[PDB]
Amino acid sequence: STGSATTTPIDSLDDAYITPVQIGTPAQTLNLDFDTGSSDLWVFSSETTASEVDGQTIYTPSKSTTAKLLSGATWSISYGDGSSSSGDVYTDTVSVGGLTVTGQAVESAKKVSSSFTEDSTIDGLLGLAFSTLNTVSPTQQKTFFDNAKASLDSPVFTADLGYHAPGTYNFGFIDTTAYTGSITYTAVSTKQGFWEWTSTGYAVGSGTFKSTSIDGIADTGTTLLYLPATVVSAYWAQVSGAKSSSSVGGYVFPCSATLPSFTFGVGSARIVIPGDYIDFGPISTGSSSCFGGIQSSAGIGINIFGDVALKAAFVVFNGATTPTLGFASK
User: What does UniProt list as catalytic?
Assistant: First the structure.
C-alpha cells in the first residue's frame, strides 16, 4: 500500500504545516501537525476541557463505530517549546492520504496548554519519530508509520515541505519526480528515539564550506533551524545589524536586510537554504526588527534541523531494519 497527502502551512510564515487525517467511522477529518520529533498521535476531542478549545476541530469517539477505549491507558507529553497535553486513549481507524491503519492509538486530549488552545489551525499532532518515545502508559503504543510499515510497498515516508506553499507527505514510495539530482542517504541513530544524523558541515552564502560534524535531528515539528552557537554566529555576522536579543529570545535582524543562503552538508552532498527561507518577519506587528530562522541550539541540548532546513530538501525517512535518512535538492 501507499498514501499521499498534501501538507499546508498554517500561516504566511510557515510556522507549522497541517495535513488532513481521517479518524473513525464515519470519517472525522482533523488537520494534524506531522511531527518527526515526537511519537504520539493526539487530538483535540470531545473530552478536551471546554475552556481550552478555541476553534479547533475535535474528534468525538462516541460518534465513531470503530472507536474503542484503550482501557486504563493515559498519556502526557511536554514539547521542547514548553507546551504540553495529556489525556486518555482510544483505538480507531486512521487514514492518511488513502493509507489506512486499523487499531491505531488515538490519544484524546483532556488538557492542552495555552499555546495549543491559541492555535486554532492545529487539531492535534501525528508523531513520526520512533515508537520508543510514545508516552502512553502502561502499554506504550506504536506510531502511525510503525503500524503501517509492514503493509507499505517500501518501509519509508517522505517529507516535501513547501516554502510559503503546500507540499506533500508520502508513505510507502519515493516520488522520483519530486526532486532533482540524486538522494544522498546518511546514517541514523535511534538511541534517543529521533531521526538523528550527522551533517558534514556548512557554508554561509557564497562562502567556503566548513567541514565539521553536526549531530542533530530531522524534525518536521520544529519551525526553525537550531545549530551550535559558533555556526549561528558565523551566519548572522554576515547580516549588517543582526544581533542576538535576550529580550526577544534569539537573533534578530533589520527587516530591510537581504539574507544570505545557508548550506548544510549531507555526506558529500549539499543542501542550500535560500536566504528568504530564514526570514520570519517582524518580531511584533509593524516592527522593523525581524526574527531569524537560524537560531542557537545552546539552550536546547540538541541541534534541530527543523522546517527551515527540511523545506529546502526532499527528505526520505527510511524505516528499514537499519533506518537511514535521505536528502535531495528539489
Answer: 35, 199
Burial class (CB in 10 A: 0-12, 13-18, 19+), 213: exposed
Number of domains present in the structure of the chain: 2
Q: How far apart are CA 82 and CA 98, in angstroms?
A: 33
For residues 166 and 77, give the distance between their C-alpha atoms in angstroms, rounded to a whole number. 28
Contact between residue 277 and residue 311 where contact means Cβ atoms under 8 Å apart: yes
d(CA 271, CA 188): 18
Do 264 and 126 reside in the same domain of the chain? no
Q: Domain containing 148: what range?
A: 5-174
How far apart CA 215 and CA 228 sit, in angstroms, is 10
Q: What is the resolution of this structure in A?
A: 1.1
Residue 315: which CATH number? 2.40.70.10
DSSP secondary-structure letter at 222? -
Which residues are known to be catalytic? 35, 199
Instruction: Return the SS3 of 126.
Output: strand
